[PDB]
Every structure is written in structure tokens, then in C-alpha cells.
Write a structure and sequence with these properties.
Strand content of chain B: 15-25%
Distance between the termini of chain B: 56 Å
PDB class: virus
Radius of gyration of chain A: 22 Å
Number of strands of chain A: 0
Oligomer: part of a larger assembly
Number of strands of chain B: 16
Chain A: VP1
Radius of gyration of chain B: 22 Å
Entry title: E30 E-particle in complex with 6C5
Number of helices of chain B: 0
Organism of A: Echovirus E30
Helix content of chain A: 10-25%
Strand order of the largest sheet of chain B: 2-1-5-6
Largest interface: A-B, 3 and 7 residues
Largest sheet of chain A: none
Shape of chain A: rod-shaped
Strand content of chain A: under 5%
Helix content of chain B: under 10%
Keywords: Echovirus B, mature, virus
Structural class of chain B: mainly beta
CATH superfamily of one domain in chain B: Immunoglobulins
Chain lengths: 47, 212
Amino acid sequence: HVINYHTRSESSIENFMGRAACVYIAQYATEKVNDELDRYTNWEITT
Amino acid sequence: QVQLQQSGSELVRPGASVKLSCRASGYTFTTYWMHWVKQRPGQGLEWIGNIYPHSGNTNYDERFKSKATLTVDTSSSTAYMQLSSLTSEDSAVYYCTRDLRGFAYWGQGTTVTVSSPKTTPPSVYPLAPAAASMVTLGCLVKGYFPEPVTVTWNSGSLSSGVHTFPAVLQSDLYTLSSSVTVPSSTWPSETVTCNVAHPASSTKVDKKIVPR
């Protein structure tokens, strides 16, 4: 015919979205040299 | 509270090493950056550098190098910000900013005028006219060399309409003004005087104002 096959499991929403994606790289120190790379950094959450 | 303020320094003879003494003790000891902010009478805020007490690292800037050292001593909790090999352009207000997210904790500041000058006494000249309801008064100052001067009117009884005028420069001599307004019921009824003083020359000049 041919009989067929190949289920769309990896084309799903959760398999396309669920992957640990880096969103922000926060940088801080112990001795404050300047700002930035000061101790105590912060980041408001956005994707 | 971060106590108390900064110290004072006057004109020093050229060649000696003056030293500021910035006395912020708000411990918090001893890990912060004591950044020194300097501003001219041109209203621009410049930066003199910072110092760090835990290991001893200082800093500098291009318009104040060679050799402005920022020595640190945690026993006395002071920060030193005087520049040697100086010129006359170091006559400016010298602050002390401590370290936070901003420059939050300043000092009070000091202005250090450095040259090879001579201290001149002031001289009160009478400004009085020779008709209307109120007449403005005054007495001019001419030729005092160092910026310490005093401004009084009747020693604290007629300080209402005293306008504080700057001593703008001409021919290397300071000339300010102090004008006060008098009503016609007290002029020439009460004897008005102006008494200015110079702390650097330690000279007192007085004059009573007469209608001419």
C-alpha cells in the first residue's frame, strides 16, 4: 500500500518545548572589583 | 551612623606634603571602596580615585596621577587623599564617597587652596549714597587673597535682607558684596555697621556707616 508508520511523537508541543534552555548568565564575585562583577547581582525574570 | 565628617587643610608652603584626613567611621570594617569625589567651582564632579582596606589596592585617574596616593590604616579608620607636586588647580572641594550600590555615603568636604600666595587683610570701604521709602546699604571688600572671609550685619539683629554675593576673581583678588535694606525710620536713626573678618590673616576691619 504501503502501511505506515512514523508516529509524530517528537513533533509534539512538550517534546519541542521541554529542553533545559539557558536564559541568563548571572555574574558576581567575592571582592568587589567594579560594577559589574560586584558581589550581590540580580536579574528580573524574563525569558 | 557613619561618624563624623572630613578634616580641613589650608594653604601650605610649596614643597611640603599636606595630608587630608577623611574620618568616616561607620563600621562596616573593613571591606568597602572609599572613592574620593572632587568638584571645581565650575560645578563639574570629577573622580580622584578609590582605596580598598582588606588587601591594600588603590587606584588613580588620568587627570590626578603622579603621585596621589590613597593610604589606608584600619587602626585609625581614615582615608588619605592629598596630592603632592601640586599646582594651583587643586583649589577645589574634596569629598569622600563610601561604597554601596551607588555612591551613597558622602562626607561633608573640604576646599584646599594651594599656591605660593601672601595673606592680605580686608578693607571696608563705605558704600553710602549722598528720597524714597527704603534704601539698600552695603560696604565693599577689595583685595583679600585667601578665600576665608566673614559676612555679618549688626552681629545678628539685621540679617533680613542680606544678599550673599560671590567673590568672583579679577587681578588675583577676591571681590564680593553684602547689601542689606534699611527703612527710613532707622536711617540715620540707629548706627548701622558692617564687620567682616579674615581668619587667614587674623585681621579685623570695622567701619560705621555715615550719611554723606
